[PDB]
């Protein structure tokens, strides 16, 4: 198929062939598996102290005093799991393998599939993204990489009738729960993914919900955050071309 290139003013400036990978049949089950693995693989090992509750010489008196056979120290129960201050019977363990493997082929297929979901306006709309456009992904000239100011990227996005998505992501959510006590108070919608070629867009990165990436290493997660296919993306002329052989 064909993809309409846009200059830094938002006007049409020719067009190139949309590479074959964007025709890869959308596979949400494979995309979800790739994201699930990437998410698991960055989780940190944890577990309670191996000796927690065991630092005591507490002994049970056995039969005789009308008491349950429970280890006691200074007239206070200890060690056993049913005892307050006792050990945790089956606690989290550091030794546990919290990683998920994934065949390279299966993962690479998910990358291609997530890439292809990006070329479907309906899917992108179902994912939640706000925009007034028919063609997708949004292809732009390589000059986008030379932009420096965030506001300039804004103007271009408004000129591309795609800025409404950033308006959507411009709302943080103060999460329910104790994640707040561990530094996870906020969360926000995922908006536009900017795929460049030489370096991630420093100018577009701070945009609400935006993620920047490069064609050589863009992954399933940035292409389909949370395992959901069809992220509103904007490739760079060269990025579009590079992504073709992934």
């Amino acid at each position: 198929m064909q993809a309409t290139i846009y200059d830094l003013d938002g006007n049409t400036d020719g067009e190139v062939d949309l590479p074959d990978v964007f025709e890869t049949p959308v596979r949400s089950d494979l995309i979800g598996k790739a994201v699930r693995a990437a998410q698991a693989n960055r989780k940190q090992d944890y577990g309670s102290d191996e000796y927690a509750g065991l630092r005591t010489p507490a002994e049970s008196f056995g039969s005789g005093r009308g008491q349950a056979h429970v280890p006691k120290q200074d007239g206070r129960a200890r060690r056993v799991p049913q005892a307050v201050k006792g050990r945790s019977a089956h606690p989290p363990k550091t030794e546990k393998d919290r990683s998920l493997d994934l065949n390279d082929k299966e993962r690479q297929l998910a990358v291609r599939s997530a890439l292809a979901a990006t070329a479907d306006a309906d899917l992108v709309a179902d994912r939640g993204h706000e925009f007034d456009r028919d063609e997708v992904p949004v292809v732009v000239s390589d000059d986008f990489e030379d932009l420096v100011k965030t506001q300039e990227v804004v103007s271009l996005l408004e000129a591309l009738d795609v800025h409404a998505d950033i308006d959507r992501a411009d709302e943080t959510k103060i999460k329910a729960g104790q994640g707040s006590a561990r530094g996870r108070k906020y969360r926000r919608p995922a908006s536009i993914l900017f795929v460049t070629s030489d370096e991630p867009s420093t100018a577009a990165r701070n945009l609400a919900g935006a993620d920047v990436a490069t064609a050589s290493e863009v992954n399933t997660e940035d292409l389909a955050p949370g395992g959901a296919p069809g992220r509103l993306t904007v490739f760079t002329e060269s990025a579009l071309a590079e992504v073709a052989e992934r």
């Binding site: 707040s180 006590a181 561990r182 530094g183 108070k185």
Partner: protein
Amino acid sequence: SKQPDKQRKSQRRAPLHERHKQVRATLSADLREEYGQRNVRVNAGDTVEVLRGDFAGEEGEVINVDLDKAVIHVEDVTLEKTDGEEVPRPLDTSNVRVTDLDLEDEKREARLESEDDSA
């Protein structure tokens, strides 16, 4: 760090000289333009305007600046005790704006006027 416990901790345990930054207030439009700074460390000679509490809108001279509790006393911003005595209502500098500066100190003035440093 990004961790909340560590952030609050470093703010509550900061050594005396690091507490000066906890008693900073935004400068008025005129003062910002004049010295090229958005805010300043409120001093006990400055005049300030309350922008947020029950005293919002009132102006007065800063009478005291406590580094430990990171709070300031502004003239007439008070509370009436039971016995009738009038005691100051502690204010957080964040709810205040500096409209006039006490520049009797050569060092403070120099710090304000210099462009490579902020007071």
